[PDB]
């Protein structure tokens, strides 16, 4: 049992909240340990495992096992307290310093993220901070993909972080309350500002690599939009209208995406699916275009 590990997890949270450590270097270490701990606790299991455990509890027909759920609950309580405090510290920190330590802190934020999805965090986190900052950072994401060539190097830093940021955004969108916060932050606006979509990637390093990269950005952002759309009530709701505007305004890209090949094709294929999901999920983009 990684019970012994639990104590270290507590110490880590303590130090972070305290934000002692002149070195972000120190905090990077704390973030790394926390990340492993969160990951370790839930060995890759998916909703099926949870459903099986619930049934067994079903009810305690005899002696049940509910060990992993119990462990997750304890982790989440500890984390909550310490949490509000530490969320503040973790996000601010974020930005700066450490573009480095960043790779570590964004990964920590994402793991944490699943668990403690649901709950808790959405409220806290919401507010603050994050949203505002993260949406603005979408705009700047577009700019950051170009700056991407330069910095291929400084890339190492940022791939660990930028990808982590997209993931964090996608995860928030997966749930109702999270999607609401992102959308409130003016997601569509930042995306319009990034101008990632309102262009043609082909227009324009070995060229297939750049296409893979650009399309890659498009697939994640597109997933974030689709997730935000569906995650609310995609119908009469306001969300449906916003997504439709997204499609029409960035039409012809959707159409253009539909045919061709490579790993680039693979990325293209995923992008195509993502648009399709956006289409049906909304009022059928086609349906709207009666």
């Amino acid at each position: 049992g990684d019970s012994s590990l639990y104590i270290i997890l507590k110490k880590l949270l303590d130090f972070i909240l305290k934000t002692g450590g002149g070195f972000q270097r120190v905090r990077t270490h704390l973030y790394g340990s926390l990340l492993y701990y969160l990951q370790i606790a839930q060995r890759p299991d998916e909703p099926d495992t949870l459903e099986a455990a619930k049934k067994t509890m079903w009810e305690r027909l005899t002696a049940p096992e509910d060990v992993f759920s119990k462990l997750q609950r304890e982790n989440i309580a500890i984390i909550e307290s310490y949490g509000a405090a530490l969320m503040e510290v973790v996000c601010r920190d974020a930005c700066d310093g450490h573009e480095i330590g960043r790779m570590l802190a964004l990964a920590l934020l994402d793991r944490i993220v699943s668990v403690d999805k649901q709950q808790q965090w959405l409220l806290y986190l919401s507010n603050s901070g994050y949203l505002k900052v993260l949406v603005d950072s979408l705009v700047e994401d577009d700019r950051t993909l170009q700056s991407l060539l330069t910095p291929q190097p400084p890339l190492l830093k940022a791939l660990y972080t930028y990808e982590s940021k997209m993931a964090f955004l996608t995860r928030v969108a997966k749930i109702q309350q999270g999607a609401l916060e992102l959308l409130r932050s003016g997601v569509i606006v930042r995306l319009a500002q990034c101008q990632v979509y309102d262009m043609r990637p082909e227009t324009d390093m070995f060229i297939p690599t750049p296409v893979d990269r650009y399309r890659q950005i498009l697939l994640p952002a597109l997933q974030l939009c689709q997730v935000i759309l569906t995650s609310s009530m995609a119908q009469h709701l306001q969300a449906a209208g916003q997504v439709l505007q997204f499609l029409i305004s960035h039409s012809d890209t959707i159409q253009a995406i539909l045919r061709c090949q490579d790993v680039s094709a693979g990325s293209l294929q995923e992008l195509a699916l993502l648009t399709g999901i956006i289409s049906k999920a909304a009022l059928p983009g086609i349906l709207s275009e009666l």
């Binding site: 890759p44 067994t56 027909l61 005899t62 002696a63 043609r200 990637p201 082909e202 227009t203 324009d204 070995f206 060229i207 297939p208 690599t209 750049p210 296409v211 893979d212 650009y214 399309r215 499609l247 012809d252 890209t253 959707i254 159409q255 253009a256 995406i257 539909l258 045919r259 061709c260 090949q261 490579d262 790993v263 680039s264 094709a265 693979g266 990325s267 293209l268 294929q269 995923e270 992008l271 195509a272 699916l273 399709g276 289409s279 049906k280 059928p284 983009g285 086609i286 349906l287 709207s288 275009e289």
Partner: protein, 594 residues
């Protein structure tokens, strides 16, 4: 929206590759390009379409395969076709015979050289001779052009000589002699003056002035290309040390500079210029742009590919990867189609590509996890029913082991069992199988519909393998049957049939029905295989249940209550002896009493 438009298109294209794969397999003579040309006719494709015709002319247009020669031929034939069509439609019907010369006279006379005739040509007997020679040349009818000059009535006659030998040879008229002399005359006399067509003929035939362009009579973009193609001199260019050499490479670069897609306007036409110019890579990349229709670029590449080009994904040209990336879009949804596309990779025959193909397929199987579709399915003896890949064939066993082991990591049991069946590791299958059925047996009750799952799976394999030349270990099979027997006991346990359950449980020969032989049941307990050792808990308590319910004290003659009573007793002694080696529910006691 929904865009059934593309999906329909996707399917149409997929259909065509599919037929192409059938032909390759069946040694057929199905043309890819004619097939696109047929579909492409409809619209916007009127560009893409012309592109396809260009490729098709190339069909077996090797015929050797000279870059500029073929490009020239395409342009020349196109012009000829254009000429024939104009003639083929009213008039006179032209007065004379249909000879090629006359057709061109018609083009020159009827077509737009005259609104109502006139200006700056040299004309004899109503005919611009130089224009004629130029157009005949344009058509590719060099011989006729030469003849016209012969008959000409002209006085630059030295040129006449230089035309004939240009014609005689490979058309790279290279006399170690005069060419130099012709050039001087051009510069002095011809260059600063004359009738546009005359200049064209001199310049083009001579390769007189490498700074390039013909003033008055370049009327079309293709005219523009054709002229340039005529000018380049590939063979023995390196030999001879003047710098009046113009190469395909040089031509290609000019097309790039700025001339740009915009410059080649009809952007529509730019595509064609790229193919003609030999910029295949650029051509795919360019097709790669509008909506490039990743789909279109992919297929065109496929077509160049059939042609045996590609001689060394927005910007990623390699054929394997171009195909692979294309697959990414549809692979999850349409794994079959993905296979069809990956298969094309072999079209480039050679190792490397072959492995790339294999790796791609391997990669497809893994993570798509569409095992049945991709790998195969159910024996009913009769080996595998082939998966799509198997139809293509070969390395399939090694992929299976790889996938199966991976399944083991993930713990995706069922997939593993499925994979091992294909692997034909019969013993392995049953063993994994015994494990699956074994747990799920121990647990708590209320399950087991009579139609589908691990139990059902159990039934499938036993019926299936055991009769037929069974390769499995006897031990392995034995536990298998026991698990099945226990399961049938379950079916009948509840759903009534109390009496039947005892009979079957006793048959198991696991639990002491007889005397105090309960202890022998101890001795034989530790020996028990791990799978059964686990199951016993329910065997007991099932017994004390039926035993209880059946032996409900009856109302108001032979009633031997004593048995079905002794059975409980022996069972309890049994349970009493192994409670520690059991989960910890001697709540047999609750059922035991009342």
């Amino acid at each position: 929206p929904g865009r059934s438009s593309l999906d329909n298109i996707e399917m149409a294209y997929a259909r065509q590759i599919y037929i192409y794969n059938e032909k390759i397999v069946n040694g057929h003579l199905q043309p890819n390009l004619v097939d696109l040309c047929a579909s492409v006719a409809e619209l916007d494709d009127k560009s893409i379409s012309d592109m396809w015709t260009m490729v098709k002319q190339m069909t077996d247009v090797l015929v050797r395969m000279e870059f500029v020669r073929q490009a020239l031929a395409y342009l020349e034939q196109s012009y000829k076709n254009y000429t024939l069509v104009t003639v083929f439609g009213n008039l006179h019907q032209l007065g004379g015979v249909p000879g090629t010369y006359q057709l061109v006279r018609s083009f020159l006379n009827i077509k737009l050289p005259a609104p109502l005739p006139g200006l700056q040509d040299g004309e004899v007997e109503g005919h611009p001779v130089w224009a004629l020679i130029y157009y005949c040349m344009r058509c590719g009818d060099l011989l006729a052009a030469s003849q016209v000059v012969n008959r000409a009535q002209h006085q630059l006659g030295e040129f006449k000589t230089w035309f004939q030998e240009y014609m005689n040879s490979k058309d790279r008229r290279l006399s170690p002699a005069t060419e130099n002399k012709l050039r001087l005359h051009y510069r002095r006399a011809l260059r600063n003056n004359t009738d546009p067509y005359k200049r064209a003929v001199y310049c083009i035939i001579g390769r007189c002035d490498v700074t390039d362009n013909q003033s008055e009579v370049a009327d079309k973009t293709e005219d523009y290309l054709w002229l340039k193609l005529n000018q380049v001199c590939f063979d023995d260019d390196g030999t001879s040390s003047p710098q009046d050499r113009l190469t395909l490479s040089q031509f290609q670069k000019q097309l790039l500079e700025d001339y740009g897609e915009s410059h080649f306007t009809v952007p529509f036409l730019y595509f064609q210029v790229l193919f003609l110019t030999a910029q295949f890579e650029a051509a795919v990349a360019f097709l790669f742009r509008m909506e490039r229709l990743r789909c279109h670029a992919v297929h065109v590449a496929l077509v160049l590919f059939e042609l045996k080009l590609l001689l060394k994904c927005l910007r990623r040209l390699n054929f394997v990867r171009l195909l692979m990336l294309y697959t990414r879009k549809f692979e999850s949804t349409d794994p079959r189609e993905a296979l069809q596309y990956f298969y094309f990779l072999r079209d480039e025959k050679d190792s490397q590509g072959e492995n790339m193909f294999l790796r791609c397929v391997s990669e497809l199987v893994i993570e798509s996890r569409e095992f049945d579709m991709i790998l195969g399915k159910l024996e009913n003896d009769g080996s595998r029913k082939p998966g799509v890949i198997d139809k293509f064939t070969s390395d399939t066993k090694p992929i299976i082991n790889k996938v199966a082991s991976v399944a083991e990591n993930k713990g995706l049991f069922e997939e593993a069992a499925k994979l091992y069946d294909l692997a034909k590791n019969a013993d392995k299958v049953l063993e994994l199988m015994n494990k699956l059925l074994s747990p799920v047996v121990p647990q708590i009750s209320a399950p087991q519909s009579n139609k589908e799952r691990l139990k059902n799976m159990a039934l499938s394999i036993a019926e299936r393998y055991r009769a037929q030349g069974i390769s499995a270990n006897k031990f392995v099979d034995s536990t298998f049957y026991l698990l099945l027997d226990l399961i049938t006991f379950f079916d009948e346990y509840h759903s009534g049939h109390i009496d039947r359950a005892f009979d079957i449980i006793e048959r198991l020969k696991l639990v002491p029905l007889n005397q105090e032989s309960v202890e022998e049941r101890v001795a034989a307990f530790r020996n028990f295989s791990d799978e059964i050792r686990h199951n016993l808990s329910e065997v007991l308590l099932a017994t004390m249940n039926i035993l209880f319910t059946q032996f409900k004290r009856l109302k108001g003659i032979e009633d031997r209550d004593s048995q079905l009573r002794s059975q409980a007793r022996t069972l309890i002694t049994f349970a009493g002896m192994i409670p520690y080696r059991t989960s910890g529910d001697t709540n047999a006691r609750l059922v035991q009493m009342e």
